[PDB]
Amino acid sequence: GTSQWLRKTVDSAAVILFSKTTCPYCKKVKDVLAEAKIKHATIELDQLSNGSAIQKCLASFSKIETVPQMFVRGKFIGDSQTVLKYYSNDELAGIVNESKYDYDLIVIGGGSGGLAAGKEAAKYGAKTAVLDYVEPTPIGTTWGLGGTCVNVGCIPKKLMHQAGLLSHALEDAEHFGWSLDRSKISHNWSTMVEGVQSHIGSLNWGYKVALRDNQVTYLNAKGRLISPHEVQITDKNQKVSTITGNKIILATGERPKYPEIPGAVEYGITSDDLFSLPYFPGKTLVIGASYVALECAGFLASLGGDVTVMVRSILLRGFDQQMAEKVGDYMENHGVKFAKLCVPDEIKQLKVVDTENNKPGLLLVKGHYTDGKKFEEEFETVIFAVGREPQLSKVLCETVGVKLDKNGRVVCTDDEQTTVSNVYAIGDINAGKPQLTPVAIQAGRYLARRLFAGATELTDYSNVATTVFTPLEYGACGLSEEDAIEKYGDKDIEVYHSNFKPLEWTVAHREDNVCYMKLVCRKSDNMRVLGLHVLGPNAGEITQGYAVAIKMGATKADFDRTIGIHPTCSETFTTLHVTKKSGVSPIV
């Protein structure tokens, strides 16, 4: 048991020390490495149950049982003195620093997971290189380091959400007494895009800095794994070179799909273009139903745009459909038009995008409804959010044996290992895992600690909370109501729910009985909270805390004996009492 673990650890760590807190010559060599600016992992045997056996099983590797014991890339490098003996004659640089390969770790893709993994690995001695490149969109849009979230995802998405929410803040401010000229307030897209792009620019550059500050080599180069330990890089000159690493982390993410219809690539855009668009989109058609589609339709409308969403079948497939319908219901009642049960057939261009005056072109979208009537309408902008797909054929010489699935994602063990044992996959390309930035970050950091500091903890992908940043936000943790009934049967499921009304909405004359929340519980398992769902303002702030309790096995009674904070939206979870089976109405 313990020896399978120590075998992996010693082979994988680049620079690691085993030590004790209460023993001198442990303390003694740490300070010397410090002084020498040589980074390393450390395992305080005094602080593990296992430590007993390990310092003893350790002698299988060193012929030794003293602490300290220092290893480098799988090989014992000595005692108290043999290492001082290396600083001694100044030979502790080419010792800690030589490897079969150029790097302990090459990370391919510089997004949420890849930068997080790279950084944490460098923190324990790993010689690390991060590759990143951004294949432009069909119109030539590109961006800097940081990945989908930072550049064309949650970050700009949420800022434009915020700008949208300020619309309702400007409305609300009048009823709270502010002298406000709503007959003279407009929104300027270019000003907003420039502020958003300036904060993105500062994150692109904060990430370069951060890589430099942690002795990580950043390469603006496309990476192709040609063999388990070999990565071919092509740079901005199209110059081709080869580099070698012991561990490889694939973290290349996905890019938007287009539908295969005439004029879609040529005249439509995706989220990749939206957030740096020079010109206001104007009257916009969003094609799709993902949380991406509704988030974008949502703030465009709150920015005053004329917005339409084309929905092939249902909203937010994969999410609790009662909540999805409530989300959709709020947007329809606040400006968003929905062309329901409708697909596109062609996009025909009527006007070309004016680089001159930064104004959109004009498109004719032709489509058909399920009922056979034809869709034909003009839009200045058409945005596809019909899903996202990995681009790995462009990264994995399929000679190398990294097994992909149907959808092009990487088949992984529970510790992120691919079918090539030194190659791991994190983030959106890891088949079957939730596709979210914090997941990718915990995966990369936790994996980096297993590789290079002997950690054991795996990433827990279960009950990962989400929030959809539609005009009215929807946060969730755990199962939808339909999935809990599927798994356990209707009679084993109790659902407590309630409408509520933000105090902020009262003076502001917003809706009663629109915001809503519910706990899905297992009668047979002590009313274990299996899924939490909340529709209302600040739904992410609300939900996050409860994801800790749920991960701990919260039951209904745990919610009930917690005392609310007043006045908040979140406190309503601590007083829920109407059940669905009751028939009683959740209104307030």
Next chain:
Amino acid sequence: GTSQWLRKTVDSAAVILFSKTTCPYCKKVKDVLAEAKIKHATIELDQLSNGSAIQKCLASFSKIETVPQMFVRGKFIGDSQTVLKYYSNDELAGIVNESKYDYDLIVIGGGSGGLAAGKEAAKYGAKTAVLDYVEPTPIGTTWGLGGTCVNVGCIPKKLMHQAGLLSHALEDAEHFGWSLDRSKISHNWSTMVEGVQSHIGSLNWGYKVALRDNQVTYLNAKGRLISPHEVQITDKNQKVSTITGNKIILATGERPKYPEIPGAVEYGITSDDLFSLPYFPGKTLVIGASYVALECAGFLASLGGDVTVMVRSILLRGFDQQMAEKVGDYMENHGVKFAKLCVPDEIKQLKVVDTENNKPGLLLVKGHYTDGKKFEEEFETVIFAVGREPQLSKVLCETVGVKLDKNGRVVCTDDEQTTVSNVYAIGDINAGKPQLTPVAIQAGRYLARRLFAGATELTDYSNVATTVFTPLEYGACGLSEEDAIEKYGDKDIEVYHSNFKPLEWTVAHREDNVCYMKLVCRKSDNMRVLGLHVLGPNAGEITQGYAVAIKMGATKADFDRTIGIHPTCSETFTTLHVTKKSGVSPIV
């Protein structure tokens, strides 16, 4: 054991039925009471571990072991047939309805706890009366039903907070692209007060309705307990009468204190006056340091007022003082002036309040600093928030034996019982308990279930989360850092902390490294989270969820293995790693 419990239950319940789910004639009599509009508690013996012994120990009271068994005010009223036998001849009204006293329950005081207790008791058959009266402030301010929170507390306080936050929303909106005329935006106090008063009016009346709809008798009358079961009421005619109840719940709350200096009662105001004030306060001096003082100084300043806070010694005594200083630091840097280590000696009137044009008067505040220099400054309004005190001498003929403490609050057992066994105390007047509306509500509801439906659960007063609604909010659950070190010693305490920055603040050019959060943990108890502290926007929404986990015994590792929601402020709790002992800086 079980029999001590059933003895209390049968004596106390007004109308209660013992039953089984899977037995007919249980189901049989419920529907008949339903049809008869007679409310009652119900205890499904099939659903308790205890049920075994109880249906058997039940025969000590009825001479019976059948279900159903129905009692009224301590006395068995029969079987399947003896009750149908009472509906039968129409005598089931004066049976369920007669008592030694006019009421199963008189609640004295119609505030958060009292209305919640009254309502829940009526729901199980208790004949209930709620008394409420509002002694005017020294200037004659009064208000309707609902208590401190609804009328002159968290509700108006938080709405005026909101109006204050919209000030920064109007600022923020420009950087997010909105064409906004800040050289032409003012705030109108009277418009805001009127909106706030209109929502309060609708709550005053929603509460009257709710009492009427639950067959509760509401009396706008001052109540005085003259004997354990006798309450003297004086109405708006000063007509004096007497009423009797079996159980008495004292829920009369507190009223603001004034300092004993010339001109304070005559020319100053309290929070009781602030929220209905006809006129803008104008240049204002807030005397005090409570969360009340800072909340009010805070939104007045965000409303554009010239605001000064007079602080005798420290801010927010009783709260974590590192956080208190950060709260204070933010307000000082955003307009609030602090006259530190300063007390008032006299208020002299310079101008009388103009009922005519609704404009404040003018005051000269004379005071002295600790350093001996004299304070002397003009203010249009002066507000005292120097604490709050119960007024029970005006309610308890001290003949009756309800033991008060030093401060005038009621000494209670863990189940809210006073020293007179049928008389309970809830809310702010219950000595030693946190003084918060949701506490009072859970106390009253939970107590009502023990009295009248045989419930056993007590209210848990430990680890009750709070939020202070200063311009930058401060939420907390559990111990301050200083109290954890006092209780467990410095070397047993680890503190993880971090600065953070709302995404919303970036484009808006607000402060880096001002918002802040920390977990106070017990090294010796598995890094058990002993106190959580967060300074930032939406601090109540953030904190609430975590209070469930903490009540469940959350450790640091429970926080770490939870995955964040991105992008949120709250997610930063799931990635904390800098410790205080580390010396490393919490910045970002």
